[PDB]
Amino acid sequence: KVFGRCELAAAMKRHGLDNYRGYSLGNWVCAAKFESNFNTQATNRNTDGSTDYGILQINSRWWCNDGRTPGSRNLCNIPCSALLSSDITASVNCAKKIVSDGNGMNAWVAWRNRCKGTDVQAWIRGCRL
Ligand SMILES: [Cl-]
Ligand SMILES: [Cl-]
Ligand SMILES: [Cl-]
Ligand code: NA
Ligand code: NA
Ligand code: NA
């Protein structure tokens, strides 16, 4: 599913991501924009052989199981395919774990490089929330 911007903001809020670990909703929407262009089915193979899955491009090295990432972990206790669902619950629950791991949203390199420090409120501007 490719979410609209305000549609995704609303879904993220529904699932408790707004201000989670102090990160406002615009941060999460901005991260999703640059990770997946709001497409729940996004996948991307990394040079290390891991793969990133879903709206927030969660990586199989640590967070989910895809059966093809040697030496990896599955700390969200989910198949990586669950992160591709139209329903964002699994991605949100895993993102909560990731952002709590110590480096905040810097875990998402694209957030650090493209969202951090910017007017992230613009990503939720105009939305009925
Ligand atoms: Cl957009
Ligand atoms: Cl915001
Ligand atoms: Cl933080
Ligand atoms: Na992989
Ligand atoms: Na894994
Ligand atoms: Na594996």
Side-chain angles (χ1 to χ4, degrees):
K1 170 174 169 172
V2 180
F3 277 81
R5 176 176 65 85
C6 291
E7 189 190 14
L8 183 60
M12 288 176 156
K13 177 169 189 184
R14 173 90 276 269
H15 291 89
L17 206 52
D18 57 312
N19 216 208
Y20 191 87
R21 270 300 233 267
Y23 288 94
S24 68
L25 191 54
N27 282 285
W28 296 105
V29 175
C30 184
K33 172 72 178 176
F34 296 123
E35 290 295 357
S36 66
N37 206 16
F38 302 150
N39 188 349
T40 65
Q41 298 194 85
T43 62
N44 288 290
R45 194 83 190 255
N46 304 125
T47 52
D48 74 352
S50 68
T51 303
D52 301 324
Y53 295 87
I55 196 110
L56 286 169
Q57 290 291 278
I58 290 173
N59 185 265
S60 64
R61 173 68 53 200
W62 288 106
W63 305 109
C64 64
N65 180 56
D66 66 8
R68 62 161 207 197
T69 311
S72 75
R73 301 285 289 279
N74 178 11
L75 294 174
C76 294
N77 304 297
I78 52 168
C80 296
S81 65
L83 300 167
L84 304 182
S85 176
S86 52
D87 185 315
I88 69 168
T89 302
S91 284
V92 170
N93 290 346
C94 192
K96 287 178 180 173
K97 284 208 165 66
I98 295 167
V99 75
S100 301
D101 193 57
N103 299 142
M105 287 192 76
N106 301 106
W108 290 271
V109 170
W111 176 86
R112 179 170 57 77
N113 288 332
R114 306 181 74 175
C115 298
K116 182 180 191 181
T118 74
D119 178 17
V120 294
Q121 152 67 210
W123 291 100
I124 61 165
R125 193 158 266 137
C127 300
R128 187 173 191 85
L129 285 166

